[PDB]
């Protein structure tokens, strides 16, 4: 009895459509950089220049 | 351009005798045309260098 069920019976659903993405992708750090904390940036050149008087 | 350059020569009178005749003759000239070329190229930091003096 049963028939057939033309189909091959199996999970309707598939994993995808079922996962949820976080909004936010982390990224690698690299070692620190404290030049700027130790003395501080003056910017008073300009760029195409040569030398700093 | 082209050319004319007719021609054509006469003899002594006589009543039987055969008639002379004239003609031309064509010819043409040609010139060729002649294309050149010159260019210019410049940078960034050249230019600001230049500009600089």
Request: hydrophobic letters at 40%; proline letters at 7%.
């Given at each position: ?5 033309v189909?091959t019976?199996?999970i ?7 996962q949820?993405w ?8 690299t ?18 220049d040569?030398?700093?008087? | ?6 021609a054509?020569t ?26 050149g070329?010159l260019?210019?190229?410049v ?7 230049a500009?600089?003096?």
């Amino acid at each position: 009895n049963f028939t057939a069920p033309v189909t091959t019976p199996s999970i309707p659903t598939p994993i995808q459509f079922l996962q949820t993405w976080l909004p936010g992708f982390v990224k690698v750090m690299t070692a620190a950089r404290k030049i700027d904390e130790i003395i501080g940036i003056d910017t008073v050149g300009s760029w195409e220049d040569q030398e700093i008087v | 351009q082209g050319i004319v350059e007719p021609a054509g020569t006469a003899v002594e009178y006589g009543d039987h005798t055969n008639i002379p005749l004239t003609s031309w003759n064509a010819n043409f000239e040609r010139r060729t045309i002649v294309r050149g070329e010159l260019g210019m190229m410049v940078g960034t930091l050249e230019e600001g260098r230049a500009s600089a003096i």
